[PDB]
Every structure is written in C-alpha cells, then in structure tokens.
Design a protein around this ligand. Sequence first.
Ligand SMILES: Nc1ncnc2c1ncn2[C@@H]1O[C@H](COP(=O)(O)OP(=O)(O)OP(=O)(O)O)[C@@H](O)[C@H]1O
Ligand SMILES: [Cl-]
Ligand SMILES: [Cl-]
Ligand SMILES: [Cl-]
Ligand SMILES: [Cl-]
Ligand SMILES: [Cl-]
Ligand SMILES: [Mg+2]
Ligand SMILES: [Mg+2]
Ligand SMILES: [Mg+2]
Lengths: 189, 197
Amino acid sequence: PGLFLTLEGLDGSGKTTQARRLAAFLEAQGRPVLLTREPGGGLPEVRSLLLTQELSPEAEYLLFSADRAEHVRKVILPGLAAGKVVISDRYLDSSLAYQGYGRGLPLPWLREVAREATRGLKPRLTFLLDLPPEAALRRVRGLEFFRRVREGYLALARAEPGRFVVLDATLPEEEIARAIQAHLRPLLP
Amino acid sequence: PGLFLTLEGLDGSGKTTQARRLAAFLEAQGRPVLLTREPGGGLPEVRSLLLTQELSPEAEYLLFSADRAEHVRKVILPGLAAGKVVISDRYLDSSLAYQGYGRGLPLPWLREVAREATRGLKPRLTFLLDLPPEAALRRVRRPDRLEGLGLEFFRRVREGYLALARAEPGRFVVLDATLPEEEIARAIQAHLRPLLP
Ligand SMILES: Nc1ncnc2c1ncn2[C@@H]1O[C@H](COP(=O)(O)OP(=O)(O)OP(=O)(O)O)[C@@H](O)[C@H]1O
Ligand SMILES: [Cl-]
Ligand SMILES: [Cl-]
Ligand SMILES: [Cl-]
Ligand SMILES: [Cl-]
Ligand SMILES: [Cl-]
Ligand SMILES: [Mg+2]
Ligand SMILES: [Mg+2]
Ligand SMILES: [Mg+2]
C-alpha cells in the first residue's frame, strides 16, 4: 500500500502551496497523509548547513543525500508501509536539477550516489510546476543559473514523461490544484 | 480486469501508427490485445453510410453514436472483461472534436447522447497526438467523409481536442506529434508502464 508523490520546480513555482492544497484535499476525503519536505525531512540539522560559509556543491549534495537517505528509511517508507499518501516538498529531482544542470556536477555521479541513498525509491508521480526564471524571481524574492535549472527539470521530464506531470505554474492555483487532483483520481487508494 | 486505451488526433498526426505500434509491443510481451477503431469497430457498414449525398451533422453524429454504442457492447466491454488491453484508434473525443467543435453541434447534446451510447465508459488514458493542422494536412490526404473542408475546420478540431484535454488533464496525455516517431513511442510506453502491470 501507500502512494509516494513529489512536487518539483524553481523557487517560487508554488510547490509548497500545491503540496498543502493536495494534503488538505486528501485529508478532507479521510485519507492518511504524510506531508514532508527536503532538505530537513530525514536529518533536520542539515538545514543549518545549507546556510553555511561557502559550502562546495559536491559537499552540499552529499549532505542532501545523507538527509534524503535518512528521510527515505525512517519517514517515507514507514509512511508508505502504513498506507499513507506521502507527499514530499522536493525530492532527488531537486538535487539533479540544481546540482547537475545548475552547478554542473556530473549526472552519472549524482545518480550513482542517489541509487543507494534513495534505495531505488522513485515517486509514483512528480508534479513539475514549470515557469520561467524571470517569473520565479518575481514570486520568491543570476538568471543564467535558474535558466539551466529550469531546462534541467524539463530534460528530466523528457527522460521520464510517465512519472513527470508537467504543469504551467503561471496558471491559477485552483486550475493547477484541480489538475493535480485529476491526475491522482485513478491512483487512489 | 482489463485496460481501455484510446489514441486521438488529426489524420496524419501519427495516432494510427502509434496505436498499431503499441499493439505489437503488447503482443511481443505476451499481453492479450484488441486493436480496434472508429468509425467501423461496432458497425463496419456505417463507414459507407458516412458517404451520403449531403449528410447532415445530426445524422452523421447519430451514425457515429450507433456505431460506438455497438462498439462498446460487442467489442470493448467483452475485451476488457477478458483482461485484454483494448486499444481504439478514435473514440468519443473524435466525435466531440469533429462534430462538436468542427461542425458546430452543441456539446451538451453530444454528451447527453453519449451517456447511454458509451454506457459511461471512459478510457484509462487517451494519447492525443497534437500538431498544427497545416502540418497534419500536408502529411496525408483527408478521408473522403471530410472532403471539401477548409483549413479553419481542422483548426477548430485541433483546438477542440486541446480544450477537452484541459477539462480532463488526468485522462488526456497530450504529445507533440512533430517529434521523432521513436520518441513518441517511447513516451506512450512510459505512461503505460505503471498501468501494465
Ligand atoms: N498559481 C499561482 N499563481 C500565482 N501565485 C502563486 C501561485 N501559486 C503560488 N503562488 C505564490 O507564489 C509564491 C511562491 O509559492 P510557494 O512558496 O508555494 O513556492 P515554492 O516553490 O514552495 O517556493 P520555494 O521553492 O522558495 O519554497 C507565494 O507567495 C504564493 O502565494
Ligand atoms: Cl517515466
Ligand atoms: Cl494518423
Ligand atoms: Cl471519454
Ligand atoms: Cl511539418
Ligand atoms: Cl481527467
Ligand atoms: Mg516552499
Ligand atoms: Mg542537492
Ligand atoms: Mg499532458
């Protein structure tokens, strides 16, 4: 039993908003739900090292992967074992987009590290809230970096189009929330 | 038991090619398959009746519905009951796009008629092979039932499909039909991986 779902996208794309909308929707149907996030979901103390004095991208990813390893084993898998819909605000795909396409780290190395960290656990669906960097920076707070990240997410979507549900994040919140519920309707329970 | 899949788009979009390709893939993996199509899957002779002097759109839809009524009861539902993957080249969305948005018949009437014709049966997934109608028209000639229709007809049909996709985004899997044939076959395969099983 259980159903693992993730929300993905740039900063200010609406991940947390749609994650909370989905949680409350499933909760209103009386379904068990575990809303979680990355980083912090497995090892909460890793979030302090995110805001650390000029941390290298390789070390940053390995901290993410340590947290994600603990997140999978002690929170997500038990949640799935208990029949919950586990929704994670960010997952592996965040690291692949930001570290791989954004910062430039080799993808085979990232996937090699992730293979044992994640225990092979892929989301059943991943909802990619896609919008341009210019719109993303207006929502949340160089644009060349976020352009590579955006293209990375689409490259990952192109590689796994069954898993990735690509949605226009500039659409209204209701229209996006209604669409996410439509993609999940047949998967429940 | 069973899994009901449909493919949609303009003729020349590649939905026929991909429908045939999907069936061979499932046959190759030892999965029972029923490849079918509309118009003709229920009542073959309806294809001939669609070529009539100056057939009205109301009669035309009702011929499609009579055909589809029989297609659901005689072919699809028996197929699904037996555990088969039923692949239909065109289903109800074709009538909605071509006779609704194209010819201009009211959508509420079409959906009310379809409710008993289809027995409420919706496919688990519908693969829409989307492309511009100018691109579709250049690839293959239109079927004889659609003879003497301008570019603006097929634009309304193209946009009608996309409107249906917005209303049912879970069911519809919209694909770019200007991509390579292998890439579209790979994408259709990937969407069906967790459903087959
Ligand atoms: N569909 C929408 N249309 C317009 N604005 C939206 C929409 N969805 C969310 N927002 C707004 O955009 C901002 C970003 O939302 P949210 O924090 O959920 O994105 P996020 O991806 O979680 O950001 P971060 O990655 O920084 O945590 C918020 O102020 C929110 O109100
Ligand atoms: Cl996939
Ligand atoms: Cl075709
Ligand atoms: Cl339908
Ligand atoms: Cl072309
Ligand atoms: Cl839907
Ligand atoms: Mg957030
Ligand atoms: Mg990372
Ligand atoms: Mg789609």
